[PDB]
C-alpha cells in the first residue's frame, strides 16, 4: 500500500552503488520513435549496445550465459546438466564480488534473513533462484527463468519478460517487436535516457499486456532488488511501493514457497524528487 521506505532507501544506495553500470549514451542508445497504441515505432528499441563490455569484463558476460542456454535449451526441461550447473555458479561468483551484491548481503545479513558466509549466502541463492520447483509435482523451472528467461515453460506461452538484456537478445534474434512507449494522459513524456520505461513489445508477432523495464542497470541490480523483496515476507505475492531516483516503483514478485516467480518493477511515476 504505502511507500516502504527502508526499501526506497536500501535501492537508491544500490542503484548509487551500481558499479557495473551500463550507461545511457556511450554504452547503449535507445530509440523510443513514438507511442504504443495511441495517439509509429519501426526500428529496434535498442540502437545500439556496447558489445565488448557486454562480451566479458562484466557480470553481463556470465548473465548472457545463462540466457543464452535456454535459447539452445538442448534438452527438457527437467533435466539440469552439469553445464547448467557451472553456469549458474559462474553468474552467482560474479555478482557476489560485487559492490551492490556485497550491500544486498549486508541487508539481509542483519535482518538474519542471510548468514554472514559468502558460500551459504551462495547456496541460499542458488536454492532461491536455480532449484528446479513445479506447479502437481515434475519441477520443470526455476527463478532465473521466470525472472530474467522470460517463462517458466520451456516452452513458450509467453512472457514474463522485463530485463533489458534479455529485450536486447530476443530483439536481435527478431523474436521482440517493439510497439512503442506507454506514458500517461497528463504527465509528460519518456525520455532515451530514463531508467526506467513502461515499453510494449509482441512476442513473435504476439500482442501483448505493456510492462516496464529497468535499462541500463546491471543484472546484479535487479537480482538484488528481487532477492530481497523476496526474503521481506511469507505471502504468494509483494508488491513493494518503492521510489527510485526519480521514479515512483513497484517492485513485485510472486512467490512459490522457497522459491521465487516472476519478478518485475512496475512504473507509477517519473518526475517526483
Not at 497504441?37 to 545463462?66: M, N, W
Not at 526455476?142 to 512472457?159: A, D, I, L, N, T
Request: glycine share 6%.
Amino acid at each position: 500500500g504505502q511507500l516502504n521506505h527502508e526499501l526506497s532507501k536500501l535501492f537508491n544506495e544500490l542503484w548509487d552503488a551500481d558499479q557495473n553500470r551500463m550507461k545511457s549514451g556511450k554504452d547503449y542508445r535507445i530509440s523510443l520513435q513514438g507511442k504504443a497504441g495511441y495517439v509509429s515505432a519501426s526500428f529496434p528499441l535498442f540502437q545500439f549496445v556496447d558489445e565488448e563490455k557486454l562480451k566479458s569484463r562484466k557480470t553481463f558476460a556470465t548473465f548472457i550465459s545463462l540466457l543464452d542456454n535456454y535459447e539452445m535449451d538442448t534438452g527438457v526441461a527437467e533435466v539440469v546438466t552439469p553445464e547448467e550447473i557451472a553456469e549458474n555458479n559462474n553468474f552467482l561468483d560474479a555478482i557476489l564480488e560485487t559492490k551492490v551484491m556485497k550491500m544486498a548481503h549486508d541487508y539481509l545479513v542483519r535482518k538474519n534473513q542471510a548468514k554472514p558466509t559468502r558460500n551459504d549466502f551462495k547456496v541460499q541463492l542458488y536454492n532461491i533462484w536455480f532449484q528446479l520447483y513445479s506447479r502437481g509435482s515434475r519441477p520443470d523451472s526455476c527463478g532465473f527463468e521466470h525472472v530474467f528467461v522470460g517463462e517458466s515453460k520451456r516452452g513458450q506461452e509467453m512472457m514474463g519478460l522485463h530485463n533489458w538484456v534479455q529485450f536486447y537478445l530476443q530483439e536481435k534474434r527478431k523474436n521482440i517487436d517493439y510497439k512503442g512507449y506507454v506514458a500517461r494522459q497528463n504527465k509528460s513524456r519518456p525520455d532515451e535516457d530514463d531508467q526506467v520505461l513502461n515499453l510494449q513489445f509482441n512476442w513473435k508477432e504476439m500482442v501483448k499486456p505493456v510492462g516496464s523495464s529497468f535499462i541500463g542497470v546491471s543484472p546484479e541490480f535487479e537480482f538484488a532488488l528481487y532477492t530481497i523483496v523476496f526474503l521481506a515476507s511469507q505471502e504468494k505475492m509483494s508488491r513493494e511501493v518503492v521510489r527510485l531516483e526519480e521514479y515512483e516503483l513497484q517492485i513485485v514478485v510472486n512467490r512459490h514457497g522457497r522459491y521465487i516467480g516472476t519478478a518485475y518493477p512496475v512504473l507509477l511515476s517519473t518526475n517526483n524528487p
